[PDB]
Amino acid sequence: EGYRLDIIESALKSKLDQDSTSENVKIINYLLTLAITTVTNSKFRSSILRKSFDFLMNMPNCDYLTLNKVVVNLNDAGLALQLFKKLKEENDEGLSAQIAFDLVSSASQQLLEILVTELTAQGYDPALLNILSGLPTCDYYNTFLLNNKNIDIGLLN
Amino acid sequence: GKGLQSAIDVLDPLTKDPVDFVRQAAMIALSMILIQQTEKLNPQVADINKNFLSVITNKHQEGLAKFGACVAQGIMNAGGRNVTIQLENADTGTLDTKSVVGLVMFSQFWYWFPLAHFLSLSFTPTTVIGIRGSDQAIPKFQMNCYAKEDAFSYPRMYEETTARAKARAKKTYKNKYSSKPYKVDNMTRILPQQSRYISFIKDDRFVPVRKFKGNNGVVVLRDREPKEPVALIETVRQMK
Amino acid sequence: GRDDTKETVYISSIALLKMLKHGRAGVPMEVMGLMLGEFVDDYTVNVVDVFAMPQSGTGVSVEAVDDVFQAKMMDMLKQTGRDQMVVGWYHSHPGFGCWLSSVDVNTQKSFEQLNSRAVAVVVDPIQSVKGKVVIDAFRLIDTGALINNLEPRQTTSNTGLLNKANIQALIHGLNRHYYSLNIDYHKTAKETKMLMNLHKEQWQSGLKMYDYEEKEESNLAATKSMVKIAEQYSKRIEEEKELTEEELKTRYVGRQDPKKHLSETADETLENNIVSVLTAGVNSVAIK
Ligand SMILES: [Zn+2]
């Protein structure tokens, strides 16, 4: 309410340090809900989202769902680039595939295209490139539609 | 797709008023609230379909009402009944630009009927699909669903010696954690309502890379038996 | 192209006013006049203004299609602009309703063999009221398209299906010989701004108090009427004690209800009195 982001940062850095992964995830998600549903000043919203992103990045173990929410809401290509940098440094293939699929399932087209182009320029693992291209996801959904079809043709007749 | 009851109560008078095109609009909208909903999920679903059949029949109805009922039947039983409309995004908060654009376009079919097909933009499949992640190959594995099987199922098809002699002488609703989890295969219809109750098996050749969040997205598993072969569902691109 | 159902005829203010003035002036003769406009496109038929054809001594039949008058009026209207086509004809059907007859069908056939997209707008000055001027264009069905049963109507829009065909119009045959059209009066800011002047009083009438003898006789008469109505109200309240609802639902049907009269008299005299006070004070202060 007071538009005091620095006080939020100080309180978070004071409290979350002496806490576990799950508890910090809970408090950060509560803060994210408050920012999403209550904050009106869009610039303040972007600021708090960015600081939450930084706090989750610095946190030892990171729940990538929260970072996915943050990068989706803020819609910043560089932040997702830093996220993928950290993920490739950790060399988590399953985490990489899951985060790429989640980003494909929910992201603005411009950000997705820019991130794919930058990842290709940096020459990441081609699995991430093809996944983020969007072809495998739509292909799998098409397969789901084709295999499990159930149509009431009699009703149409 | 939310299936909110109060909206249905408000729409109930609208679908029965004298004015025909209001009936058409109400019928189309009512099929947008109850998309991918079975009679077991909500008692009012079956009567709405009966009303749709009655309006499609009973030739003494205005053409606007006939068109509304036909398009409502088309929407309510969406493609293979395996796809829903989700203006809201997944666990995150997003408008999902494609869906909003498509539904704005579908609301424009008051001056161009061909534009009604634009609603196919917003159609989003309902699936909890698993992949190996090592090679992006779909495996076959069962998952636990802690709910009654009698709810999240496809609706039924369209249907239309003297004693013996004296014997004759005298003749003159929550479904919340119902336990007993039942296996659901991969690549199967997972309603967003039931997606929260979907759970994996603690022991399996494949274990999720993360904790399942009850959404309708893609979950990458982890091969705990990287040597043995298992049956793979082949994607349409795969056989070329 | 089998036409469409979203076709709309756009009638300007000039055309509609001339239509009504000419229709009311010839009751009950079905006067007819041409209709100068332009064909914007397949879906829109703009109409600029109309002019009247003379009514020959035929009576109640629309058959005077004199060509000399039409040619002269068209040629020497061009001298002062209005370079437009002969888009349609309008004829008034006073009293019956909006529907075409056999003679009307033949005349519209004659027009169609010249333009093939000629509307047949039918005014009706008799049954028109201030806000519901009844107007609806018509155009003949093709011919043997009834073998295809596809009378030229492609419902590519809901804008044409919203209008509902009249009951008595179907008796003469609406969807059998002439598919109906839509009517959309299109205005202009200049015209709607300044037609407001019909209800703008003269400036020198607001401050004009009327003679100060009638304003006292009226007050005295209103007070006497109030006294009598109050007495009737007293007897009404007395009589209402012993009456059952099935009578009160129909009791004051044929006799003066001495309550609405009281309220009406009070409101009317109070409004007149307030206006009188304000006028008197305003002139006493400002005029001096
Ligand atoms: Zn006539």
Side-chain angles (χ1 to χ4, degrees):
Chain A
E1 298 277 353
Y3 301 94
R4 296 302 301 277
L5 83 165
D6 35 34
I7 309 190
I8 301 152
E9 305 202 31
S10 51
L12 281 176
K13 74 153 298 283
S14 65
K15 195 253 188 171
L16 85 84
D17 288 2
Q18 43 85 20
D19 269 314
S20 322
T21 307
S22 47
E23 213 269 349
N24 283 348
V25 160
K26 306 152 195 147
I27 175 67
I28 285 309
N29 261 6
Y30 173 68
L31 172 77
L32 273 194
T33 287
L34 285 183
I36 282 297
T37 289
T38 283
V39 182
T40 75
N41 196 322
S42 308
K43 282 147 305 310
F44 187 55
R45 168 194 282 284
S46 291
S47 301
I48 173 179
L49 262 303
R50 193 172 328 278
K51 301 325 289 169
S52 206
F53 195 56
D54 288 359
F55 286 145
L56 257 291
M57 209 58 102
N58 307 355
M59 192 178 138
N61 178 25
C62 322
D63 183 18
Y64 290 84
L65 206 43
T66 283
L67 301 123
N68 158 54
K69 277 190 178 183
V70 162
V71 297
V72 157
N73 283 293
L74 192 39
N75 239 1
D76 178 278
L79 266 39
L81 245 191
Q82 304 169 5
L83 160 65
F84 269 103
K85 274 278 190 178
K86 163 197 186 70
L87 183 38
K88 187 178 185 174
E89 293 333 290
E90 284 196 328
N91 265 349
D92 299 350
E93 53 276 48
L95 285 204
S96 308
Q98 189 74 7
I99 218 175
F101 269 83
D102 252 326
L103 247 188
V104 161
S105 204
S106 52
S108 72
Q109 275 280 324
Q110 300 87 319
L111 164 152
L112 256 198
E113 298 144 347
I114 287 184
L115 192 57
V116 165
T117 293
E118 298 329 293
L119 279 188
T120 308
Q122 300 193 7
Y124 275 44
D125 176 32
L128 298 123
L129 303 177
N130 67 55
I131 287 172
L132 274 185
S133 72
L135 287 318
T137 312
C138 80
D139 179 35
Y140 303 151
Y141 281 135
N142 200 22
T143 62
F144 171 83
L145 285 178
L146 216 175
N147 293 111
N148 321 277
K149 36 184 288 155
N150 167 248
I151 313 101
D152 188 13
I153 171 67
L155 171 129
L156 201 69
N157 301 138
Chain B
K2 327 286 183 180
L4 202 31
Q5 155 85 354
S6 48
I8 317 292
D9 302 45
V10 153
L11 273 198
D12 165 332
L14 269 190
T15 198
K16 286 318 144 187
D17 89 9
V19 167
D20 50 16
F21 77 95
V22 152
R23 274 201 314 255
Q24 152 184 148
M27 263 167 200
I28 297 171
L30 240 170
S31 161
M32 230 181 325
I33 324 284
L34 320 182
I35 179 162
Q36 274 204 336
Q37 291 290 328
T38 326
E39 179 45 3
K40 295 107 163 197
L41 264 307
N42 192 295
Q44 307 126 24
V45 177
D47 17 325
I48 294 324
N49 303 12
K50 260 192 314 299
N51 151 83
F52 286 168
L53 255 295
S54 168
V55 171
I56 290 295
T57 62
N58 185 12
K59 64 228 160 310
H60 292 57
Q61 284 306 128
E62 272 82 353
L64 282 317
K66 305 283 195 178
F67 175 90
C70 178
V71 177
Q73 282 190 189
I75 285 302
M76 161 75 88
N77 312 348
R81 310 171 152 172
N82 286 348
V83 58
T84 197
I85 331 176
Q86 218 179 357
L87 279 185
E88 203 271 293
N89 204 304
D91 48 9
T92 158
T94 327
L95 330 169
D96 169 293
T97 310
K98 261 151 266 284
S99 303
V100 153
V101 152
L103 248 173
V104 151
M105 280 314 81
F106 176 73
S107 306
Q108 204 86 231
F109 81 132
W110 214 268
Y111 326 92
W112 211 238
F113 277 66
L115 287 177
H117 287 294
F118 255 74
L119 187 47
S120 96
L121 260 182
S122 75
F123 273 129
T124 63
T126 35
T127 307
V128 178
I129 176 183
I131 45 175
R132 202 169 288 192
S134 47
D135 40 5
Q136 312 310 113
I138 288 89
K140 294 182 183 175
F141 72 87
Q142 278 58 26
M143 260 179 299
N144 309 333
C145 155
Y146 297 87
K148 319 180 176 185
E149 237 285 333
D150 202 14
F152 317 116
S153 48
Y154 291 86
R156 78 270 317 293
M157 282 325 288
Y158 178 61
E159 296 165 7
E160 325 184 13
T161 73
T162 165
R164 317 177 204 262
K166 300 325 282 187
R168 74 211 91 161
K170 294 332 181 213
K171 164 188 312 166
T172 206
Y173 277 109
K174 22 75 190 301
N175 321 132
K176 176 261 176 189
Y177 278 94
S178 306
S179 70
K180 339 285 186 172
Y182 69 89
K183 308 307 172 184
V184 288
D185 271 295
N186 205 18
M187 292 285 307
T188 313
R189 174 151 61 81
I190 310 289
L191 288 88
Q193 308 308 317
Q194 82 172 139
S195 52
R196 158 189 53 259
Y197 309 139
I198 277 304
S199 163
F200 288 73
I201 310 192
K202 342 281 174 179
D203 44 68
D204 181 36
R205 163 169 157 172
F206 310 106
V207 151
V209 156
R210 215 156 46 199
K211 176 189 172 193
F212 185 62
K213 333 97 187 177
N215 56 291
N216 295 339
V218 195
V219 40
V220 171
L221 313 101
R222 185 189 315 107
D223 194 1
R224 322 195 71 167
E225 311 175 346
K227 325 300 202 281
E228 334 182 24
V230 85
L232 315 82
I233 319 197
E234 211 165 2
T235 161
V236 177
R237 155 162 286 192
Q238 245 169 8
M239 52 299 297
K240 176 182 76 174
Chain C
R2 299 325 292 200
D3 280 327
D4 30 56
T5 183
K6 33 186 314 170
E7 235 210 6
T8 49
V9 182
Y10 283 20
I11 302 182
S12 324
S13 41
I14 304 307
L16 175 58
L17 280 193
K18 279 182 177 182
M19 258 167 212
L20 258 295
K21 203 217 62 152
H22 187 214
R24 199 68 170 67
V27 155
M29 291 155 228
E30 311 182 13
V31 308
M32 151 200 111
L34 302 194
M35 203 149 133
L36 298 203
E38 97 196 19
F39 294 118
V40 199
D41 90 6
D42 190 282
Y43 304 70
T44 296
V45 183
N46 257 341
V47 167
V48 194
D49 73 40
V50 317
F51 63 97
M53 270 316 78
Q55 175 60 27
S56 301
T58 54
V60 293
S61 67
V62 201
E63 289 178 4
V65 207
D66 192 12
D67 176 277
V68 179
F69 198 138
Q70 157 182 348
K72 170 157 298 313
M73 201 55 148
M74 281 285 328
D75 248 16
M76 69 179 186
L77 264 187
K78 206 79 52 182
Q79 280 200 348
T80 70
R82 213 71 51 200
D83 40 299
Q84 270 100 345
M85 315 188 13
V86 203
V87 173
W89 69 296
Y90 82 106
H91 85 280
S92 71
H93 270 141
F96 347 93
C98 326
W99 55 267
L100 283 200
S101 60
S102 60
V103 175
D104 299 309
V105 161
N106 301 355
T107 308
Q108 189 56 34
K109 273 172 178 171
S110 287
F111 270 116
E112 281 218 30
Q113 311 292 53
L114 264 77
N115 311 120
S116 88
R117 305 186 69 243
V119 312
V121 168
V122 167
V123 279
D124 200 334
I126 280 310
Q127 35 192 305
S128 51
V129 152
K130 328 182 176 184
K132 204 215 172 186
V133 184
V134 316
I135 275 232
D136 40 317
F138 299 94
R139 193 149 66 198
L140 318 159
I141 216 161
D142 171 35
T143 33
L146 298 160
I147 303 163
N148 198 23
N149 310 50
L150 218 68
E151 61 283 310
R153 309 261 85 197
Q154 327 161 34
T155 78
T156 64
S157 178
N158 274 342
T159 44
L161 268 306
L162 286 183
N163 72 79
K164 299 326 286 187
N166 196 8
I167 162 70
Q168 64 162 325
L170 280 159
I171 290 321
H172 316 96
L174 201 136
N175 283 68
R176 294 231 321 280
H177 313 79
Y178 39 87
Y179 61 99
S180 159
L181 287 200
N182 310 14
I183 285 299
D184 266 21
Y185 333 101
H186 96 83
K187 276 170 278 278
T188 326
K190 320 175 182 181
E191 297 167 357
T192 174
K193 234 198 163 190
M194 81 86 77
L195 286 177
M196 191 65 58
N197 304 338
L198 171 151
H199 190 267
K200 271 150 63 74
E201 84 196 0
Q202 277 222 295
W203 86 269
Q204 60 214 76
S205 94
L207 301 83
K208 170 187 182 181
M209 62 215 68
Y210 305 124
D211 164 332
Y212 264 102
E213 184 67 25
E214 289 78 344
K215 285 192 175 185
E216 86 69 19
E217 286 147 318
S218 72
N219 283 338
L220 198 186
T223 317
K224 210 175 307 302
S225 160
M226 263 149 179
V227 165
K228 260 156 36 145
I229 290 325
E231 155 214 12
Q232 279 184 15
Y233 203 84
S234 310
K235 294 173 321 283
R236 193 276 277 277
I237 287 184
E238 191 46 10
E239 99 166 7
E240 200 267 347
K241 305 161 148 247
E242 51 272 343
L243 269 175
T244 87
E245 158 271 347
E246 325 89 21
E247 290 89 40
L248 292 327
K249 69 156 219 153
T250 168
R251 175 75 284 150
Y252 309 64
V253 186
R255 84 191 60 261
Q256 323 284 320
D257 183 16
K259 172 156 143 42
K260 195 182 71 83
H261 290 347
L262 197 46
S263 146
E264 155 279 338
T265 316
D267 219 295
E268 145 70 0
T269 202
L270 214 161
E271 160 170 357
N272 178 22
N273 283 143
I274 274 294
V275 173
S276 155
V277 184
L278 188 50
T279 278
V282 157
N283 280 6
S284 146
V285 169
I287 285 326
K288 159 61 193 161

